[PDB]
Structure formats: structure tokens, C-alpha cells
């Protein structure tokens, strides 16, 4: 599994409220950080203008 095969996917968030659901549904970012849910990673990328992708669902 080389570079192209292992690429992350874009956080996709459906909710449009300038806020997130309070579920714990963790995702693992390409930065090695666990985000408590996909909405919070979307919010964080928007806020800080970053492009952290999802390596996989669950904690890192």
C-alpha cells in the first residue's frame, strides 16, 4: 500500500448550523489526531483553513 493507494478522504458534513452534533463518533485525521466526530473535523478545517483528511473511521 504505497502513497496514492493510502490517500485520505475529505471530511463531508451534512449539518448547516455553525456548530456540531455532540455524539462521540471518532475519526482519525491524516495529521494523526483523533477528532471526536466528522462535523468537528469539518468545523476545524473551515475555522483554521486547514485540509486535514480522514485516514479512517475510529480513533488514530
Amino acid at each position: 500500500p504505497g502513497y496514492l493507494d493510502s490517500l485520505g478522504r475529505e471530511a463531508k458534513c451534512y449539518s448547516e448550523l455553525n456548530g456540531c452534533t455532540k455524539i462521540y463518533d471518532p475519526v482519525c485525521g491524516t495529521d494523526g489526531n483523533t477528532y471526536p466526530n466528522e462535523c468537528v473535523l469539518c468545523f476545524e478545517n473551515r475555522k483554521r483553513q486547514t485540509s486535514i483528511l480522514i485516514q479512517k473511521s475510529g480513533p488514530c
Binding site: 449539518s15 448550523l17 456548530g19 456540531c20 452534533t21 455532540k22 455524539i23 462521540y24 468537528v40
Partner: protein, 224 residues
């Protein structure tokens, strides 16, 4: 729960957890066989655990009961989180005692200034990751419709309300969704969403349980 305290043993006997591999949401026992939680907590398989205080070390009053039936509100809206509510039918009747018991639905909609108790195993840090072992409790008042709409313009439906502090520092957080907001012995709210946790002028938003009292009993009745 950010800025809360360890719940006293026997103070939230109605608190449950929803589990899929881990602690992912809370819920409230509202009948010997039924839990109420958030629509966004829906999964096709859920194990309900009752009587937990410490979520990592068994204390001996825990009950582990798989969901027979998991019913997200049929008008749940993923874009707006309108009707962020869900019923779980336990595959067996909970055994009722001092550590496990039901909480009444609300007989009238939330009143501004009412003291509520919020509980859960969600994050304790507004920054980073601090998930506690010990169940967390928060005292927080119901906020006016005006402060709620000011905080979340055009995003508060008549099925939502605000509880907490405009000053920030105290709130529900990720992992608290589906958890209870109990005011004067009634489940007035379910933990739903907000703009982060414990941010200035961004109090938690809660599903207004009063508006679902008829759908809750009707749906329980039809599936008994």
C-alpha cells in the same frame, strides 16, 4: 460535560449509555423497557448500559441490555438537527432499584430560569480530549428564547432550546449527545448540538422533549 462535577452515587438513576464498540452517546430511562436519546446517536445495533457511575470499573449494579428496536424520529433532519430525538426499546425490562429508575416526561414546556441537571461521560475539555471515567453532572439554567436565537441565529427551531451560560466555561460536549436535561423532576431536554463546548455566547442546544410527549407514548404503545 465541561466545568461540571462527579455526580453523587444515586443522583441520576435514569442515566444510561449507548455503546457500539465504545461509549458514544447517553440516554434517559423513561419506562421500565424504553430509553430516550438523540436522533444523531442512531446506529443499527446498540447495547444500552444502565447503573454505570465509573464507565471503566464495574461497581456491580450495571445492567447490559441490547436494543430490540431503534427508532430515530421519522422527521429527523440531518441538515438542521430538527427532531433530534430517538426511542430505544430494551430487549428485556430494566430491573428497577435505587441505582436504576425512570424519569418523568415534562408536563409543560421549559421555563426560563428553571434549574436543570445535565449529565454524561462526554469531553470535559473545551480544548483537546479529556474523557472521564466518572459520570459528570452540571447545574445550568434554561435561557430565554431571545438569548437562544441571538446565540444561534435562524438555526433554533421550536423543537430546540438553550441551557447554560453566555459567559461560557460550562456546557455539554462531544459524547454527551442523547443525555438528559432534568429540571424539577422532568426530562425537559436531550443533549443535541452547539458551536463547540463552553464557548462564550454559544450555550448548548437541546431537543425540547415536551413537543414529543404524544409521539413518545404513541410509539411506545404501538411497539409494546
Amino acid at each position: 460535560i465541561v466545568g461540571g462535577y462527579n455526580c453523587e452515587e444515586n443522583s441520576v438513576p435514569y442515566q444510561v449509555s449507548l455503546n457500539s464498540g465504545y461509549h458514544f452517546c447517553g440516554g434517559s430511562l423513561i419506562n421500565e423497557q424504553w430509553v430516550v436519546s438523540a436522533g444523531h446517536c442512531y446506529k443499527s445495533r446498540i447495547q444500552v448500559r444502565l447503573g454505570e457511575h465509573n464507565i471503566e470499573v464495574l461497581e456491580g449494579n450495571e445492567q447490559f441490555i441490547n436494543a430490540a428496536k431503534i427508532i430515530r424520529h421519522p422527521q429527523y433532519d440531518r441538515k438542521t438537527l430538527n427532531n433530534d430525538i430517538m426511542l430505544i426499546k430494551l430487549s428485556s425490562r430494566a430491573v428497577i432499584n435505587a441505582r436504576v429508575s425512570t424519569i418523568s416526561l415534562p408536563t409543560a414546556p421549559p421555563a426560563t430560569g428553571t434549574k436543570c441537571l445535565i449529565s454524561g461521560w462526554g469531553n470535559t475539555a473545551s480544548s483537546g480530549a479529556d474523557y472521564p471515567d466518572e459520570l459528570q453532572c452540571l447545574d445550568a439554567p434554561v435561557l430565554s428564547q431571545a438569548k437562544c436565537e441571538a446565540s444561534y441565529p435562524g438555526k433554533i427551531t421550536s423543537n430546540m432550546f438553550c441551557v447554560g451560560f453566555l459567559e461560557g466555561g460550562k456546557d455539554s460536549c462531544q459524547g454527551d449527545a442523547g443525555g438528559p436535561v432534568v429540571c424539577n423532576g422532568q426530562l425537559q431536554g436531550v443533549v443535541s448540538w452547539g458551536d463547540g463546548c463552553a464557548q462564550k455566547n454559544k450555550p448548548g442546544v437541546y431537543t425540547k422533549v415536551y413537543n414529543y410527549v404524544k409521539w413518545i407514548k404513541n410509539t411506545i404503545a404501538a411497539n409494546s
